[PDB]
Amino acid sequence: GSGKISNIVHISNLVRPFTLGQLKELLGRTGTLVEEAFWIDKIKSHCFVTYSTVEEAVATRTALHGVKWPQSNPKFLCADYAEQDELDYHRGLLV
Amino acid sequence: GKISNIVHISNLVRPFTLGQLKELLGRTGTLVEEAFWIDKIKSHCFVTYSTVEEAVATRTALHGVKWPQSNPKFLCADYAEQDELDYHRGL
């Protein structure tokens, strides 16, 4: 299970309910988020989390892939690395 | 998440043959055989389909499935761009 390493972690299988503050608290345990790059979809099913270093992104992917969050989520999270092109497609910056 | 003709499947765990994995993958479309890539240790794979619609049928079918039956994990299936595949292939 090896996506190309980068400073962006793509987390899937998120299920409501949860607040953005709760998600951001989980994410900050393993590094420092770049707030200005952060992205989540309207329905809170997946997000792209840019970290201050690549090493923080690797710590976070490692910690979060295959965990259950929130506690009552029926799914386990899928966490992998993402390229800027993928993030920017979702931000509406690239076709 | 960007829709493509390449499905990336992770959380594979042995034992399984390539025959069994390919049979599974073929349930939902035609593979471009020469494009298929798996790691030497059989933990994740990129699967090119002959059309985009076949890749989407596959992603939908396999994301979150436990395969093989013995796998302690559930599969993660998502789309990939050609240059992700090319990175793993060498280029």
Numbering used by the authors:
A (entry chain A): 1006 to 1100
B (entry chain B): 1008 to 1098
Paper text:
Acinus (apoptotic chromatin condensation inducer in the nucleus) is a protein involved in apoptosis and alternative splicing regulation. Later, Acinus was also found in ribonucleoprotein complexes: the spliceosome, the apoptosis- and splicing-associated protein (ASAP) complex and the splicing-dependent multiprotein exon junction complex (EJC). Acinus was shown to regulate splicing of a subset of apoptotic genes in human cells and to facilitate constitutive splicing of pre-mRNAs containing a weak, alternative 5′ splice site, favoring the mRNA isoform generated from this site.
The two AcRRM monomers are covalently bound in the crystal structure via a disulfide bond, that generates an interface area of approximately 500 Å for each of them (calculated by the PISA server). This indicates that in the reducing conditions the dimerization does not take place and the dimeric assembly is likely to be a crystal-packing artifact. RNP1 comprises residues 1049–1056 [KSHCFVTY], with the deviations found at second, third and fourth position of the consensus sequence (underlined). RNP2 comprises residues 1014–1019 [VHISNL] with deviations at the second position of the consensus. H1015 and F1053 are present in these positions in AcRRM and are likely to fulfill the same roles. The aromatic residues of the RNPs in AcRRM are exposed to the cavity potentially creating an RNA-binding area which is occluded by the C-terminal α-helix in the absence of the ligand. Interestingly, the 10-amino acid-long C-terminal α-helix of AcRRM has a caspase-3 target sequence and can be truncated by this protease down to six amino acids.
